[PDB]
């Protein structure tokens, strides 16, 4: 009843109580990752994925 937010194993906040209702929301971080370019040799084609 008194708890306002929750944490993952290593410090990071992973859930919050909405202060107006009582709902508990999980937080997922922004989607992110490496852009990687898959290519034949430029000697044979210029199409890439």
């Amino acid at each position: 009843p008194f708890q306002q937010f929750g944490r993952d194993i290593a410090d990071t906040t992973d859930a919050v109580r909405d202060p107006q209702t009582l709902e508990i929301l999980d937080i997922t971080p922004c989607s992110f990752g490496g852009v990687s370019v898959i290519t034949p040799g430029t000697n044979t084609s210029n199409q890439v994925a």
Partner: protein, 50 residues
């Protein structure tokens, strides 16, 4: 938190096919699949060899 984990190139299912292949070569053909094509030999005679 800016950290990313990348998958292995070979899945656990693909590794389990290679460990089945090495095992099925070893059972049916002794060491011969390490020298060339697998040559079948009866398993009692492969142990008689070993």
């Amino acid at each position: 938190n800016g950290l990313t984990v990348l998958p292995p190139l070979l899945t656990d299912e693909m590794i389990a096919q290679y460990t089945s292949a090495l095992l099925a070569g070893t059972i049916t053909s002794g060491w011969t699949f390490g020298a060339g094509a697998a040559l079948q030999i009866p398993f009692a005679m492969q142990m008689a060899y070993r």
